[PDB]
Design a protein around this ligand. Structure first.
Ligand code: ICS
Ligand code: CLF
Ligand code: CLF
Ligand SMILES: [Fe+3]
Lengths: 477, 522, 522, 477
């Protein structure tokens, strides 16, 4: 629809809010203009959620434990506090890994101190020390322990840094304290930042004096790919077929040794800028490692990123890049020839957390599909600066959208497909709009690379053209 | 590589040779992985008695718990009421997690709001958060009622829910007559079922405490039914059906079955069904109140007996045969309505099913876990079926409940090899199923990993999981099942006997090796 | 050898070393068994395209049929009536087999008598057998009605049922007013469903042919429901429940649900429920007659349209979503009763389940078999779910039914890879699942052997079986399930999606090998 | 109860029958007197069933195809005629075997000519020849074909013997025609006899001129054991531990070569006299092989049979027999010590086909249990001669009992347990009496030998003392 129609729709959606909430939410909605380079004059992000408005955002514990630290497989992560936060995040995110779950990998397990009233009143530092002792006794093959603080830890005056230092010195083990209490920040973004700082301060600087790792000129690290359904592996296979050596993966299927070996690489390949830009900038400052953002969503973005990455190395890498592109051209061309006719001209509305609302636009456009509305839960204004050019003109932009706002926008816009999280999935399925989970890939995937593009196109076709969407109205009504 | 006509998702795409080689390169080059012999040795050690002793000496570490926190149960109870918004005072991350948990279990939309208390409220309290949240929620989602629970942050800080709600009403953020019942639901006390109890008691007291003068017990000729924390819609439906069959007037207080089963017809309904405020107000006028799950409705029981003056009967959960019989006889005695021929016929059909299947069910050994009332009902039914519940785990159980379950076990010869565990998590249960192997496990989806672990030791040590309880994430539409009444007993019996028969078929499918017992007729 | 505390039945008692050695001695010494290499080579050949061509060139040999003989369906139909004894004129071995078959499927008592025709009746006929049998059966089991079908021996000999029954009445063996409807049910024609059709037509004509003068169509404001051959009690119950919900007066003719679900309460009831003779006599007074399974009720349809003058609607089996909708709309049009909000809500909940599960159901390939109406309803539902029914087998199907199913398949893009087979048995289906492997099989218990065969080729070639249909012998209480209506569609959807998820869980349970996809949430 | 009370009960039960049926059925009911050696003066058996009385008996096809011929694993058995008889008997009997079911063993498969109207009218001999050709083509590893005639074959004038001879000569294969039409005889007994005659005439005399099989002095065959749940294997292990060589098994887990090798053995061990006495007598007459009946139900009968069998051989076999008895004494003694207290004094009523009603009495008496009523479907008067001494005084005897008769007898007698077939199982389970299937062992077993005795005692305890039998009356009634 026209730009003026979008502004009118925004105004009539905001009419029902109280004056303060409406005034706040008016700053978080925008009509896109790709010619604008600064989003601070177009949209406001990374702010408080209005109380009692059904925000989708999570907490800092979700951004630290659930996003950055949890995927690291050889480490044991203690949800420090009451049982709830660890129980609700157990195996809820599909950060795939290879290992033996009771023995040397612990991603899908729930370790928690299970705080009670006595621990709230008298503190849980002694309980934390005893817990670390028991973790050492019962899981001897763990290569490190992280302590992710839940809300009460930051409020009862618990000193987990001192316990971590004492027990780590005593057991000669890495113990990383993370003050990732849920009330800190406004969303999972501050959790990302706190987890990046913890990585920098407790893990990253472990082998600075160590020079026993042989470094090749083609050493790269993958930063900010969490292997959702195997996305990191699908990116790594393409990167290694290009002649590159992927030393580290952050943090999907990641190990603590890979994090400790990252300062030795030649290039950092940052997939999720939002969650790992802090550590990327720290590594560039301290070790002089350049970092670059890349997109492996869809064949066009994949090819562009592969060429951009190969342009950072010698001519042999460029030749191998061209060979990989030529090798994979028939596969994605066949995927397009099969699925683009079934998807051409269909409109999409997206609302994912901090990277994907702009990263997956090219994969949609490669199947003839247009994105008419996008938004973020916890993105910053640099994310919207990157998003505005990737969006078309007069497309809706929403930051920290509320349930009512998103439902009203979908009702007016009427997209052919919605890509969002599990808390919107069944809401929009009941309204008759095909829905794709853009966090967990609807328990499918990967979506990165050419294999991921094949899977993604098949999934979009299987959901958008599903017969069940033509049976919502009873024939007698 | 992908074939356009045979596109492969992660399994078995990553089983391809190039992916296997890339993964092996990653493992050998940079992971610094422990040797496979060391990993195998440590796993074998974790399956042993010495590891079980070390595991059961745990005091400060909890691994894979089998419980959640109070505000989840409070949110469920609040969802049980008509056009009621669950409202959790505290941090928004908890509400996101509650909504995701219930969305994955029920595969349905779940409405709940948070007032988004942040660090600015860490020292100043969340009064302004409460006012703005109540106003915004009422303006936006137009609920008839807002039911307030707490996150652990608000409990630790010490926010006064009553004073905050009163100040919100006093300064015009919400109308003074708008119903805002509240309950303190600290995540560090009890579990989610305790939160259900607290929320229900808060709502019942909100609607009845100051209006008891004109209340006469048994003036509406109805029986109150408090279901407790319940995640099977079939259980609500079966209780309502059995009470309607008897011709017994009833009020199901906190009935969320409608809002958790909304039809897909091109329109999203945030609210559907639920206990009306008139029902809650008239609840003291009932003949009696029956608590379906007494072991986590103690606060509600105290309020109902002390304020409504209802002689709440001592009834177990209506699970299995005998306890359903006792529930029906108590309902008949309270309401004066005889048990109809349809319920007697249904009981006879359940007994027929038990006689049809007793040969395959006899002597089978089960390790089971879940909430206290559900666990003890399942144990009672298993004892009725001639089965052996060897490992009975209840993470949120207590000593009195353990004593009751021990009394139940001692009354039957099939409970002689049974041990009850309270305060133990699923790592303890994994040790138990490795050391004293049962035939089957009964529990929620978190048990699947235990099965994987057992299968890693060998096919002969694998303990298959039967998904009865909460939450079930890896199977679809199991929340529509029933576990209460004769209907629930039939469903449970069918599931158990057919799991046994499916396991036997899998074990005897080997041609020329075990297929001599691959009987067509069982 | 046996341990008194761990007694082992045949599995795994015969896996013990001494039993293995004794079996190996037996095989090597006296069995003259083919070499294992030869056996493996022949098996591998049987899984090939060349073997499939030779198998499908069969004209005279049938291997593992997927059908039974007419008198079985006649016995079921006769059991559908009130206090009615099924009576098969011919050889007692057939009655023993019918009773055993139904006892194994329903796990309940099945009453049926034979007049025990022997070689003395091979040339003389069975007139004296008919007289003595009618007299003895009436004196002993005191039925209100005796419904007579035939075994193949009586059909080949040429026994005249009408003349024999008339001579029995004329000489005082049974009273002249005693109802003895009869039907010729030759086992060499059609199948068991044909026998159900023949028996029902015989009973309907017996009760209505000579009393049509005072019959007015629509005078009782009811719709007749003829269910056909049905072995799911839930199907009878769901039809009755849906008709009662609409407030539609109905007569379910041949209703055996009560006698096949008798309670166990210390007393054996040979008879329970069933269509009364008054209902059969008043059937021509109905507004219309609806046949639930038209493709095996052609004789009944001819009689109802030609004698009762009922404009029998062209309706498919009420299976799946669209066909249930058409059935409900036709019932509403005939009876004048609107479809209530409860049925619309149930339809919306089924649609919600389909939207919830479409991701795991999409593109799945199924080989399926069974009776014609059930098979085509299942194919229609699978097409509605986005699944691919690649191998559609109906041993007792015909060319017109095949054309109808082909028309159904051609209307959906998901039927483009589907082939319909009529007159083919389960050995043909075994070749088909080896050659064009589906993801799953849907059918009765006889498919389990096919699964075993597939597993013998390898785990990667195994085709798991989903037990929907008749007969199911290796699972308990599956006959209580439902396949008709929205309720049956929900049950079928749950079974299909959870079979897919259970297979995926089994495939991804390998630790450090495939368990990267062993997702807790699906 | 008293003998007079039993006769009174028989007379009251017979009252509801019409005069002819009552007069017939009075001859088939008796009160046991163990001092009587001739049952023809006490009971009448092997007669016609009264029409329309719900007999339990089967047909001759059941006794031939389902009992004698079907268990033979390496042969393919064609149910010649309409599809029904073969379909209802497919894998319904648990005659266990070892083999590859599509390839070299075919016990649980259903081969049938699937007669139609054209085959009824014009005959099915050409169809039978074409079927045999197709069987040869598609199952090349079969070692023989049997053609079990169903009812219409005996009535349409089909000549299956000529087809069998012609095709067997042409293909150099054994083709056995069996005129086992259901209308022949009165029960499965004539099927047994016809199948025994077919074995004698077409298979047994195949290696008379062959002398390439080495014969030891301890060569025995097992005749009339059909390996129900593994019963034949449990008997064979004890027989071979005694020093004997079991050359053949008839016909459970049996092969055609074992049948052809039977005329070379030194002793025939007949378990089921009823079904295999014909072939045993023929072998004794033609080859001079002695045969003896043995009972392996329960430890007492097992020990008696083992000693009786070892007494037919030299002293070394007797020593090995004593060693086997001493080795197995603790096992069955422990089984008795565990299960006899739970079963002592409990009364049983049995109605099985032709051997087990008298053969399993000792196993019951070994657990403190008494049998108050027994009967047969199709036994002859020699079976009742053997049964009368095994039964106690004033116990009920019934031959070809009707459904009504059996319910009335159970109602008056009120036994603790009933052992019968599947057609009585749910009838008596509804009446509140524990029921054990005595044909298929309720899909359990074996019951032969000491291992079988352990299984049998466990099963009787699990059903007799099941809690479900104390819950049949609702507490409000
Ligand atoms: S063969 Fe006979 S009816 Fe002797 S036809 Fe029948 S497997 Fe019975 S009492 Mo079923 S003469 Fe065998 C018998 Fe006994 S099928 Fe089995 S149990 S010992
Ligand atoms: S915002 Fe985040 S998820 Fe919330 S508590 Fe805080 S760290 Fe945790 Fe935890 S136990 Fe339950 S879910 Fe909370 S009320 Fe406390
Ligand atoms: S007494 Fe025996 S089982 Fe009966 S027919 Fe005769 S051989 Fe066979 Fe066969 S197809 Fe059906 S079941 Fe019969 S009516 Fe004919
Ligand atoms: Fe849904």
């Amino acid at each position: 629809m026209s730009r003026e129609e979008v502004e009118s729709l925004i105004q009539e959606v905001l009419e029902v809010y109280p004056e303060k909430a409406r005034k706040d939410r008016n700053k978080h909605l925008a009509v896109n203009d790709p010619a604008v380079t600064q989003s601070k004059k177009c949209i406001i992000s990374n702010k408080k959620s209005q109380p009692g408005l059904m925000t989708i955002r999570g907490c800092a514990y979700a951004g630290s434990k659930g996003v950055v630290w949890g995927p690291i497989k050889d480490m044991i992560h203690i949800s420090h506090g009451p049982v709830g936060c660890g129980q609700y995040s157990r195996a809820g995110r599909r950060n795939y890994y290879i290992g033996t779950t009771g023995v040397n990998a612990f991603v899908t397990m729930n370790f928690t101190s299970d705080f009670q009233e006595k621990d709230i009143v008298f503190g849980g530092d002694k309980k934390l020390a005893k817990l670390i002792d028991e973790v050492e006794t019962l899981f001897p093959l763990n290569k490190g322990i992280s302590v992710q603080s839940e809300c009460p830890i930051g409020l009862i005056g618990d000193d987990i840094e001192s316990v971590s230092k004492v027990k780590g010195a005593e057991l000669s083990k890495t113990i990383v304290p993370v003050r990732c209490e849920g009330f800190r920040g406004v969303s999972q973004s501050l959790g990302h930042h706190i987890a990046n700082d913890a990585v920098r301060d407790w893990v990253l600087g472990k082998r600075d004096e160590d020079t026993t790792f042989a470094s090749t000129p083609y050493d790269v690290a993958i930063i900010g790919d969490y292997n959702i359904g195997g996305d990191a592996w699908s990116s790594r296979i393409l990167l290694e077929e290009m002649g590159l050596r992927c030393v580290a993966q952050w943090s999907g299927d990641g190990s603590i040794s890979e994090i400790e070996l990252t300062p030795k690489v030649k290039l950092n390949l940052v997939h999720c800028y939002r969650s790992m830009n802090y550590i990327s900038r720290h590594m560039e400052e301290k070790y002089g490692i350049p970092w670059m953002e890349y997109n492996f969503f869809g064949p066009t973005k994949t090819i562009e990123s592969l060429r951009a990455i190969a342009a950072k190395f010698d001519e042999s890498i460029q030749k191998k890049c061209e060979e990989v592109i030529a090798k994979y051209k028939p596969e994605w061309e066949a995927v397009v020839a099969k699925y683009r006719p079934r998807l051409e001209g269909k409109r999409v509305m997206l609302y994912i957390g901090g990277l994907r609302p702009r990263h997956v636009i090219g994969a949609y456009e490669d199947l003839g599909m247009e994105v008419v509305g996008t938004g973020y839960e916890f993105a910053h204004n640099d994310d919207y600066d990157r998003t505005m050019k990737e969006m078309g003109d007069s497309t809706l932009l929403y930051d920290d959208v509320t349930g009512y706002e998103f439902e009203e926008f979908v009702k007016r816009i009427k997209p052919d497909l919605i890509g969002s999280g599990i808390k919107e999935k069944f809401i929009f399925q009941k309204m008759g709009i095909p829905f794709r989970e853009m966090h967990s890939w609807d328990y499918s995937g990967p979506y990165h690379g050419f294999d991921g593009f094949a899977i993604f196109a098949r999934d979009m076709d299987m959901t958008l053209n599903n017969p069940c969407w033509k049976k919502l109205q009873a024939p007698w009504e | 590589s992908q074939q356009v006509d045979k596109i492969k998702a992660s399994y078995p795409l990553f089983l391809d040779q190039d992916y296997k080689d890339m993964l092996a390169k990653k493992r050998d080059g940079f992971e610094e992985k422990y040797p496979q012999d060391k990993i195998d040795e440590v796993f074998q050690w974790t399956t042993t008695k010495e590891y079980q002793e070390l595991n059961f000496q745990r005091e400060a570490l909890t691994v894979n718990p089998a419980k959640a926190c109070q505000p989840l149960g409070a949110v469920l109870c609040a969802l049980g009421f008509e056009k009621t918004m669950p409202y959790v005072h505290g941090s928004q991350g908890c509400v996101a997690y509650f909504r995701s948990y219930f969305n994955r279990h029920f595969r349905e939309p779940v409405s709940c709001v948070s007032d988004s208390m942040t660090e600015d409220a860490a020292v100043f309290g969340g009064q302004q958060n409460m006012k703005d949240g109540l106003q915004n929620c009422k303006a936006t989602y137009k609920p008839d009622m807002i039911a307030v629970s707490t996150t652990c942050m608000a409990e630790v800080i010490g926010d006064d829910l009553n004073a905050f709600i009163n100040n919100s009403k006093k300064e015009g953020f919400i109308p003074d007559e708008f119903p805002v019942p509240f309950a303190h639901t600290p995540s560090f006390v009890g579990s989610h079922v305790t939160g259900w109890d607290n929320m229900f008691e808060g709502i019942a007291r909100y609607f009845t405490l100051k209006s008891m003068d004109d209340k006469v017990v048994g003036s509406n000729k109805k029986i109150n039914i408090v279901p407790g924390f319940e995640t099977y819609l079939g259980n609500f439906r079966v209780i309502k059906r059995m009470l309607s069959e008897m011709g017994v007037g009833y009020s199901l207080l906190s009935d969320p079955e409608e809002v958790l089963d909304t039809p897909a017809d091109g329109q999203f309904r945030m609210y559907a069904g639920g206990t009306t405020q008139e029902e809650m107000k008239d609840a003291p006028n009932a003949l009696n109140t029956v608590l379906l799950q007494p072991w986590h409705l103690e606060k509600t029981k105290k309020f109902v007996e002390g304020t409504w003056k209802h002689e709440v009967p001592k009834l177990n959960i209506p699970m299995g045969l005998d306890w359903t019989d006792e529930f029906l006889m108590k309902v008949s005695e309270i309401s004066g309505q005889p048990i109809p021929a349809s319920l007697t016929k249904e009981r006879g059909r359940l007994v027929d099913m038990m006689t049809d299947s007793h040969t395959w069910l006899h002597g089978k050994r089960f390790a089971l876990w879940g909430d206290p009332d559900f666990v003890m009902g399942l144990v009672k039914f298993l004892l009725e079926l001639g089965c052996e519940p060897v490992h009975i785990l209840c993470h949120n159980g207590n000593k009195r409940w353990k004593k009751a379950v021990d009394a139940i076990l001692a009354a039957s010869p099939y409970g002689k090899n049974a041990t009850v565990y309270i305060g133990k998590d699923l790592w303890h249960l994994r040790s138990l199923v490795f050391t004293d192997k049962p035939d089957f496990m009964i529990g929620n989806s978190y048990g699947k990993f235990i099965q994987r672990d057992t299968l890693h030791k060998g096919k002969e040590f694998e303990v298959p999981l039967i998904r009865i309880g909460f939450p079930i994430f890896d199977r679809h539409h199991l929340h529509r099942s029933t576990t209460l009444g004769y209907e629930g007993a039939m469903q449970i019996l069918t599931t158990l006997v057919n799991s046994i028969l499916e396991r036997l078929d899998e074990e005897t499918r080997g041609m020329q090796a075990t297929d001599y017992n691959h009987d067509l007729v069982r």
